[PDB]
Ligand binder design. Sequence first.
Ligand SMILES: CC(C)CN(C[C@@H](O)[C@H](Cc1ccccc1)NC(=O)O[C@H]1CO[C@H]2OCC[C@H]21)S(=O)(=O)c1ccc(N)cc1
Lengths: 99, 99
Amino acid sequence: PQITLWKRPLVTICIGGQLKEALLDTGADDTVIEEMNLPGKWKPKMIGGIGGFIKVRQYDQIIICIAGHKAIGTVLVGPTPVNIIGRNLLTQIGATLNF
Amino acid sequence: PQITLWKRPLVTICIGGQLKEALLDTGADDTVIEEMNLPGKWKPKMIGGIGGFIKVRQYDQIIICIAGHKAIGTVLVGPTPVNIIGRNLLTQIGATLNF
Ligand SMILES: CC(C)CN(C[C@@H](O)[C@H](Cc1ccccc1)NC(=O)O[C@H]1CO[C@H]2OCC[C@H]21)S(=O)(=O)c1ccc(N)cc1
């Protein structure tokens, strides 16, 4: 599809068996999902942006369905205000920015 | 151009007549540039990102060239970790997400 940028580019995702709304975010290196009780091993991490840093749990090889497209990779879970699909998964669903 | 996302979508911008590097950021509503001298009037504003809220200087109707494309719009100047070109200006240069 083509997504214009008049509005936030939110799409439906499925992660850990739950549907969420998430931003397709070219400005994010990594995918950051709001606090959820995801199973399995993880590694502590801190990630920084406007305002400072949040503490997240880094999970590897997590399956996510993004707007009907499958992806698998690192997901950071923590107290983000919005669910963020970052470049690590955007590449996997074939996303480009065009102008 | 068409821009893939295996690397950060960094471009050269011209702002205040000065060249800077900035990140094309579909997850940003607004364009936020690091502290710099920029001509004319501004208003104090607060914006929030992943790590909380910061104070910025809001400049309206700023002439900015983004990878050679002309925009004129709002630029927030403040302590952002990274120069970010947000949707307010991505829409001006006709940027869409595609997959
Ligand atoms: C600042 C960027 C270099 C990085 N950010 C992604 C960015 O798209 C966030 C993504 C974002 C979106 C909403 C809320 C928090 C974070 N947007 C953002 O800060 O935008 C601000 C400027 O416009 C406003 O509109 C949205 C918030 C304001 S980030 O969220 O901080 C971030 C940092 C590290 C990772 N792995 C993932 C994301």
